[PDB]
Every structure is written in C-alpha cells, then in structure tokens.
Design a binder for this molecule. Structure first.
Ligand SMILES: [Fe+3]
Length: 186
C-alpha cells in the first residue's frame, strides 16, 4: 500500500519497504519518488556543491539493496554519456532542471553517437533509466540555477562506463562520493 512520503526520512523508510525483497517494482518506486514533494530543509545537509563539477552525496545505503544519493549540479555542470551497470536508476529532481539526452548502445564500429531523444526533467519529476533502455547524459544547462537531484540505484554500483560521443568507445570510471551521510569524504 503506497502512501505519499511526508518527508525525505519518510521516503527513505518507504524505500526500505519497497526494496525488502529481491525484485523491484519500478512503477511503484517511481511513483513514490515522484510523490515526495521536495523540501529543501530536509536535504540541505547533503547538498554539498563543488565549483568545477557535479558532486555525488550519499544519503542512504538501503541496507545493501540500493544507493540513494543526492547529486548537486552547478551551472553548466553535466555528466558523461554513461550506462548504469545492470542496475535500475531513478532520478528525481529536487531543485532546478536537468536535460537528459538518450543514446543507443554503440555498435562495434567506431562512429559518432547520435542522440535518440532529449527531454527536460523539471522540479519533482522522477525519471527512470536502465541499460535496456539505453545510455544517457544528464546536464544542468542553466546559466543561473544550480540543480539538485535525488538518485536511487539498485543494486548499488561503484563503477560505470563513460562513452566517447565521437566514437562510441567506452572507459570504466569509478564513482566517488563527495560526502556520505552529510560528512565530507575527501
Ligand atoms: Fe545516469
């Protein structure tokens, strides 16, 4: 019985219920993430920005079933084109807007990766991606507004691939956490 999360802490408790088992009801997880109304005071602790690139701030480790993290995107900050390491990946906007560009998996032949579509993710929306859907890039294209997003990955993963848009070639990257549980982790 999915109820509206009243707070971030309530959302986290609900997520622990939704991930108690071995499978993932994607539509229910997405619905509960979308139903949480972002309250900046509840997540200010995790919203630690860096001047030069986006930061990943771990919020909850989901008792091993998922990583819940907050990403903080300065103006003009964006990601690589990347995969999600055979995990579910939910992305909910907490503040601002992000541009999501979707790409197909490259072929063996070296070729330019041409976007398949793009969309603007707005405040409180929750999007979803997995490797079966494709690859994506996420970018804060704003010149004036930092963006903050809440990401849930299940199972948790510490590495993924970045893809060269000019060729489709991929390189393994290790995810680093800027902070964990509100504590800066150099
Ligand atoms: Fe992603």
């Amino acid at each position: 019985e999915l109820l509206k999360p009243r707070t971030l802490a309530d959302l986290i408790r609900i997520l622990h219920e939704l991930f108690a088992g071995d499978e993932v009801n994607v539509e229910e997880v997405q619905a509960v993430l979308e139903a949480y109304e972002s309250n900046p005071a509840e997540w200010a602790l995790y919203a630690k920005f860096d001047q030069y690139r986006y930061t990943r701030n771990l919020v909850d480790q989901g008792n091993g079933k998922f990583n819940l993290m907050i990403l903080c995107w300065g103006e003009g900050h964006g990601s690589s084109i990347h995969d999600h390491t055979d995990s579910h990946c939910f992305l909910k906007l907490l503040q601002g807007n992000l541009k999501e560009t979707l790409f197909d998996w490259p072929d063996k032949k070296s070729n330019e990766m041409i976007k398949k579509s793009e969309r603007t993710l707005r405040e409180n929306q929750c999007a979803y991606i997995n490797d079966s859907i494709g690859l994506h890039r996420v970018e804060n294209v704003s010149h004036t507004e930092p963006a903050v997003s809440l990401h849930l990955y299940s199972p948790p993963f510490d590495t993924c691939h970045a893809f060269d848009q000019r060729t489709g070639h991929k390189n393994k990257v290790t995810m680093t956490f800027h902070s964990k549980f509100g504590i800066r982790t150099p």
